[PDB]
């Protein structure tokens, strides 16, 4: 009724720890957690957040109902710049889970058996830029080429066929949007996420224009998606806006690379550490696939599970999504307090998954740790890099589809090295963590 969590002291009234955490946020949950335990409370910029680390504390927010815990009071000022208006969180829940819902119709195994083929050539297409060897920066070349693997994959070849790998600069911007002063400040700043999103809802405009420049006399009869978004209506029968079709393009598109990019270039520095790791994937591809290693299948994925699991682990240590935030409408009990509404109640994904009670040798990369009793098998909330309950991620299929098919490419291409071992340390200038200085040495493969 009465117990709140214990308060963390800040000697500066109003701004906080704004500043320390917005810094070195994992750092600084990690301190708070040693000195207050799973579950505590601070002030940033004239408003109380309330942590949930571990799997018994965070499982309250991984249960809740949107009535509950909100998540469109939090990251409407975060996203809305990035989508536009009346998609996602600038719309009542139960009209973004029909936008959800919609966005699913292409996440199926029908669909990703024609991706594997798709991302193979793209990958194989994008890096004959790259030659026989070099120093080039991964996270660059991944951002670039995801964009197209992504839009072909997720869009279809119409759109594709509209974009380039200059759009990668465009969604770097968006992506931008994804900071602690958006987090956190009036919506009126120097940087340019707002030029970006012009720009992006400008080209899907003028592809569907030109579709609904046909849509007006035109009755296609082709297998289609973009169709999709066009033909379907809402459970009140009404159609979308263009605006509501152009901010679920957008954001379809964002989704498929902002998690995918960072993510894909973590894992390479994870495996050009690790050289012993790396030839054992090599040599899992010629295992499972053939001597001769022809065309990636699907069926053949689910069978790379050494690859498998080094994705796993680079979502365990470096997820691009480190904290989730909901805003507390009604009073909230867990591990003996209550949490009153106003709160801005946060799980972090980064913390949960290398908490040191729960994680053996919790900061090194050992895709092994899969293979014996391990807390993403043993605990409900250890391990939950793309969210659980009824905010839960759609693309974790389509995530592993695209991650294991561009490095399963990408290690039949090159061997990967460090250059004067240098292992890229975390920008926190954005929410999704992105490795510093991300330049990769490669050298053509056996
Ligand atoms: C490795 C890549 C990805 C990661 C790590 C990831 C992670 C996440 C996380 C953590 C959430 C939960 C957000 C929260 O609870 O506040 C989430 C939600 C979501 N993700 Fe993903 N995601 C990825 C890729 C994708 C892709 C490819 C799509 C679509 C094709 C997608 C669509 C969504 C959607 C629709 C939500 C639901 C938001 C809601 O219901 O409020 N994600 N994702
Ligand atoms: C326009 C439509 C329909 C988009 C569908 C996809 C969205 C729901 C996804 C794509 C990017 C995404 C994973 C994201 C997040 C959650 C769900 C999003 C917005 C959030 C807001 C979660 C909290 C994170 O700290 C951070 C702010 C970095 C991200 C940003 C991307």
New binding site residues.
Partial sequence: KGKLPPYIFSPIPFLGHAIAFGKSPIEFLENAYEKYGPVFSFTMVGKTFTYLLGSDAAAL?FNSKNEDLN?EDV?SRLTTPVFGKGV??DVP?PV??EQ?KM?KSG?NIAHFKQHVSIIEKETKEYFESWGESGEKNVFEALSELIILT?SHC?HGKEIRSQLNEKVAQLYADLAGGFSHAAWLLPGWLPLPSFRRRDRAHREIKDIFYKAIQKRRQSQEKIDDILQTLLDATYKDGRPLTDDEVAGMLI??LL??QA??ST?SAWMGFFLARDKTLQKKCYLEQKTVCGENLPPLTYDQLKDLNLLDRCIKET?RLR???MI???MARTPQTVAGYTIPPGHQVCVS?TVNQRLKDSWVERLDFNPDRYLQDNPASGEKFAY?????????????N???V??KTIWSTMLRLYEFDLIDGYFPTVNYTTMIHTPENPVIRYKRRS
Avoid: D, W
């Fill in positions: 927010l998540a990251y996602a969180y829940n973004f889970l959800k966005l996440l992504a997720l954001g379809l989704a498929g998690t995918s993510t979502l997820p691009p999504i989730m935030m909901r994904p939950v890099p793309f969210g659980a309950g009824r905010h839960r991620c759609i693309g974790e389509f995530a592993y695209q991650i």
